[PDB]
C-alpha cells in the first residue's frame, strides 16, 4: 500500500529517471529498496505522517525517516523494529487535551482506549531511527512552556520518564537516588525473591 | 581512561602493560622513548626545540600544501603565470638545458606555517630531493621573499633525451605516470 501511494504522490520510478536528475532530489527507500526519487521532499513527508496519524494507508508501526543532510527518505515496514509510544506536539502545545483524558478516565462504559488515542493522532509510535529525527520533551509542562529559549521546535513529548525502566527495575523505590550498579544488582535479586 | 593529563602522552598502564611485559611482545601497544638532553639544550627551550625537530620524522606530505602536475611544452612559456619571474631568472643562465627539458611539470606548494614550524629551508628541501633522486629530478625553488613557496620539478633532461640511439619503444609510464609515481614516493618517503 505504501508503494502504491508513493506512485500516486509524484514519485518518479528509478527506471524512468534520467540519471542527471537524481542529484538534486531525495531518494525514497522502502524496506531498504530504492523505489524512486521525489523532487519535493517535505510535502511528501508531511503527507505520510498525516496518513500514519489517521491510520488510513500507512499502519502505525510503519516508520518514516527523513535525513535532510543526506537527501534520503527511508520508510521501514519491516518486522522486529522496536518502538515506544510518544505524545505528539504541534506548535508548542501538546495534542493531548482534557477531553481525551476525560474520555479515558471513564474508560469503562465509554469504550475509549489506547487504540482510540492512537487513531485520534494524540500519540504515535517512534522507533530509534525515527527517534534520531525527533525533538523530545522529558516533561510536557516544563519544556513546552516558554522560558529562556532552548528549543521552540519540540515535535514529540515523553508520556512519563519512568517508563524507560523495565519490569524488574520498576519495583525499585526512588531509583534515581541510588547508585547505578545497585539498581542493576536489585534487578537481578528481585528475580530470585520468594512470593 | 583514568590516567591524568599531566602525562601529556599516550601511556599503557595496568593489566595490558603487565601482559606486554610478561609476554615480551615484540610490538608494544604504545612504544615510547624518554630523551634526556645533555647540556644547554636542556636549559633553554629553544635548543630543546631544535633537538625535537632533529628527532621527529618529517615528510614532504607534512609540509606540502598542494601538488599539481602540469604539461608545459616550453619552460620559457611558463604556463603558470606566477612562476614566470623565477623561471625566467633561472633560464637567463639555464642549467641542464643543454641535455633537454622535460615537458611534464610537477608543481608543489609548501605551506609556510609548517615550513617555519619545523624550521625547514627551501634550499634544504631542494638538496634533499636532489640527493634522493640523483639527477633524475631537476628542482626550481622560489626565494623566501615570495609570498607563495613554489617548488617546480621536471623529469631528468638526460632521461628525456634518453641518451640512447635505440631509444627503446618500451616507453614505461611515458612521463606523466612516472611523474605521478615520483610525487607519491616523494610525499610518502622523503624523510626530510
Amino acid at each position: 500500500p505504501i508503494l502504491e501511494f508513493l506512485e500516486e504522490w509524484s514519485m518518479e520510478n528509478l527506471e524512468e529517471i534520467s540519471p542527471a536528475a537524481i542529484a538534486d532530489a531525495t531518494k525514497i527507500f522502502v524496506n531498504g529498496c530504492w523505489v524512486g526519487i521525489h523532487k519535493d521532499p517535505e510535502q511528501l513527508m508531511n503527507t505520510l505522517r498525516k496518513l500514519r496519524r489517521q491510520m488510513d494507508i500507512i499502519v502505525s508501526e510503519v516508520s518514516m525517516i527523513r535525513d535532510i543532510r543526506e537527501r534520503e527518505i527511508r520508510i521501514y515496514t519491516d518486522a522486529g523494529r522496536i518502538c515506544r509510544p510518544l505524545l505528539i506536539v504541534e506548535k508548542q502545545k501538546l495534542l493531548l487535551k482534557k477531553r481525551h483524558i476525560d474520555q479515558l478516565k471513564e474508560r469503562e462504559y465509554n469504550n475509549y482506549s489506547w487504540q482510540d488515542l492512537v487513531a485520534s493522532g494524540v500519540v504515535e509510535y517512534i522507533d530509534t531511527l525515527e527517534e534520531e529525527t525527533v525533538m523530545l520533551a522529558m516533561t510536557p509542562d516544563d519544556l513546552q512552556e516558554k522560558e529562556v529559549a532552548y528549543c521552540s521546535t519540540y515535535t514529540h513529548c515523553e508520556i512519563h520518564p519512568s517508563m524507560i525502566l523495565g519490569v524488574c527495575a520498576s519495583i525499585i523505590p526512588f531509583p534515581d537516588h541510588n547508585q547505578s550498579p545497585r539498581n542493576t544488582y536489585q534487578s537481578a535479586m528481585g528475580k530470585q525473591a520468594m512470593g | 581512561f583514568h590516567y591524568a593529563g599531566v602525562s601529556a602522552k599516550n601511556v599503557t598502564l595496568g593489566v595490558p602493560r603487565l601482559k606486554e611485559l610478561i609476554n615480551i611482545s615484540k610490538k608494544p601497544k604504545t612504544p615510547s622513548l624518554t630523551v634526556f638532553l645533555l647540556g644547554q639544550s636542556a636549559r633553554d627551550a629553544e635548543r630543546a626545540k631544535d633537538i625535537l625537530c632533529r628527532l621527529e620524522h618529517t615528510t614532504l606530505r607534512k609540509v606540502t600544501a598542494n601538488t599539481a602536475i602540469y604539461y608545459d611544452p616550453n619552460p620559457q612559456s611558463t604556463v603558470v603565470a606566477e612562476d614566470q619571474e623565477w623561471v625566467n631568472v633561472y633560464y637567463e643562465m639555464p642549467d641542464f638545458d643543454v641535455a633537454r627539458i622535460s615537458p611534464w611539470l610537477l608543481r608543489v606548494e609548501l605551506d609556510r606555517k609548517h615550513m617555519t614550524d619545523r624550521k625547514l629551508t627551501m634550499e634544504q628541501i631542494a638538496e634533499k630531493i636532489n640527493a634522493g633522486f640523483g639527477d633524475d629530478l631537476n628542482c626550481i625553488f622560489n626565494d623566501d621573499n615570495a609570498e607563495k613557496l613554489v617548488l617546480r620539478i621536471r623529469i631528468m633532461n638526460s632521461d628525456e633525451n634518453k641518451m640512447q640511439e635505440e631509444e627503446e619503444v618500451v616507453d614505461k609510464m611515458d612521463d606523466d605516470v612516472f611523474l605521478r609515481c615520483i610525487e607519491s614516493n616523494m610525499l610518502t618517503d622523503m624523510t626530510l
Binding site: 547508585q179 | 581512561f1 583514568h2 591524568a4 593529563g5
Partner: peptide
C-alpha cells in the same frame, strides 16, 4: 561516575 580522572 565521578569524573575523567576518577572512576566512571
Amino acid at each position: 561516575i565521578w569524573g575523567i580522572g576518577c572512576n566512571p
